[PDB]
Enzyme design. Structure first.
Site, PDB file in Angstrom:
ATOM      1  N   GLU A  35       0.672  -8.870  -5.966  1.00 46.98           N
ATOM      2  CA  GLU A  35       0.479  -7.836  -4.904  1.00 46.98           C
ATOM      3  C   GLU A  35       0.282  -8.521  -3.575  1.00 46.98           C
ATOM      4  O   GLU A  35       0.811  -8.071  -2.554  1.00 46.98           O
ATOM      5  CB  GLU A  35      -0.659  -6.920  -5.219  1.00 46.98           C
ATOM      6  CG  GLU A  35      -0.388  -5.963  -6.370  1.00 46.98           C
ATOM      7  CD  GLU A  35       0.592  -4.924  -6.065  1.00 46.98           C
ATOM      8  OE1 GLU A  35       1.052  -4.786  -4.872  1.00 46.98           O
ATOM      9  OE2 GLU A  35       1.017  -4.196  -7.000  1.00 46.98           O
ATOM     10  N   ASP A  48       7.093   5.970   3.345  1.00 49.89           N
ATOM     11  CA  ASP A  48       6.430   7.291   3.594  1.00 49.89           C
ATOM     12  C   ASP A  48       5.467   7.276   4.806  1.00 49.89           C
ATOM     13  O   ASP A  48       4.857   8.293   5.130  1.00 49.89           O
ATOM     14  CB  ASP A  48       5.789   7.848   2.314  1.00 49.89           C
ATOM     15  CG  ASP A  48       4.579   7.104   1.879  1.00 49.89           C
ATOM     16  OD1 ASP A  48       4.386   5.968   2.449  1.00 49.89           O
ATOM     17  OD2 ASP A  48       3.835   7.633   1.004  1.00 49.89           O
ATOM     18  N   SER A  50       2.642   5.393   4.822  1.00 46.58           N
ATOM     19  CA  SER A  50       1.440   4.852   4.271  1.00 46.58           C
ATOM     20  C   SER A  50       1.451   3.337   4.477  1.00 46.58           C
ATOM     21  O   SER A  50       2.430   2.756   4.902  1.00 46.58           O
ATOM     22  CB  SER A  50       1.377   5.213   2.799  1.00 46.58           C
ATOM     23  OG  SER A  50       2.443   4.579   2.133  1.00 46.58           O
ATOM     24  N   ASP A  52      -0.360  -0.307   2.487  1.00 47.96           N
ATOM     25  CA  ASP A  52      -1.134  -0.911   1.425  1.00 47.96           C
ATOM     26  C   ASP A  52      -1.948  -2.058   1.969  1.00 47.96           C
ATOM     27  O   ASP A  52      -1.429  -2.849   2.812  1.00 47.96           O
ATOM     28  CB  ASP A  52      -0.191  -1.463   0.369  1.00 47.96           C
ATOM     29  CG  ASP A  52       0.505  -0.412  -0.460  1.00 47.96           C
ATOM     30  OD1 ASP A  52       0.032   0.730  -0.516  1.00 47.96           O
ATOM     31  OD2 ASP A  52       1.436  -0.806  -1.177  1.00 47.96           O
ATOM     32  N   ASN A  59      -3.345   1.797  -1.395  1.00 48.56           N
ATOM     33  CA  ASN A  59      -2.542   2.626  -0.513  1.00 48.56           C
ATOM     34  C   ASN A  59      -3.317   3.686   0.211  1.00 48.56           C
ATOM     35  O   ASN A  59      -4.200   4.337  -0.353  1.00 48.56           O
ATOM     36  CB  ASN A  59      -1.439   3.244  -1.361  1.00 48.56           C
ATOM     37  CG  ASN A  59      -0.435   3.975  -0.576  1.00 48.56           C
ATOM     38  OD1 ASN A  59      -0.581   5.221  -0.369  1.00 48.56           O
ATOM     39  ND2 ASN A  59       0.492   3.306  -0.038  1.00 48.56           N
TER      40      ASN A  59
END
Ligand code: NA
EC number: 3.2.1.17
Length: 129
Positions: A35, A48, A50, A52, A59
């Site tokens: 990640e 979208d 958003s 992270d 998120n």
């Protein structure tokens, strides 16, 4: 902060992730590696709108507040900036809410596509735990 592999596990073990909802510690280290590359300041924007945040790439559509994700929730009750700390506490606490939401660790796409079903004990090998 960029953690070492074994240093990260210690941090995760101390905050109660080893076997949390049945996921052995190696699963959590593997998910952090893929990640964030173990970097607590990782951010990534999504299509979208958003973003992270942090070592586990949590998120802003559901989990923390960044002030720019319209209509989103803040289920962990934290500013997304807390997820970027050198202290992982806020990340871990929010992670524990996410994995308990019904889909387990599959909520982390790197985990599903790079860790799930692989030899994840290899991520804690050699460490003094
Ligand atoms: Na949000």
């Amino acid at each position: 902060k960029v953690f070492g592999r074994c240093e990260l596990a210690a941090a995760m073990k101390r905050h109660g992730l080893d076997n949390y909802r049945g996921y052995s510690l190696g699963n959590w280290v593997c998910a952090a590696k893929f990640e964030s590359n173990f970097n607590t300041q990782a951010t990534n924007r999504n299509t979208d709108g958003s973003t992270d945040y942090g070592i586990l790439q949590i998120n802003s559509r559901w989990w923390c507040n960044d002030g720019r994700t319209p209509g989103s929730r803040n289920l962990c009750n934290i500013p997304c900036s807390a997820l970027l700390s050198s202290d992982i506490t806020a990340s871990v606490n929010c992670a524990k809410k996410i994995v308990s939401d019904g889909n387990g660790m599959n909520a982390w796409v790197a985990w599903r596509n790079r860790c799930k079903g692989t030899d994840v004990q290899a991520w804690i090998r050699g460490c003094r735990l």
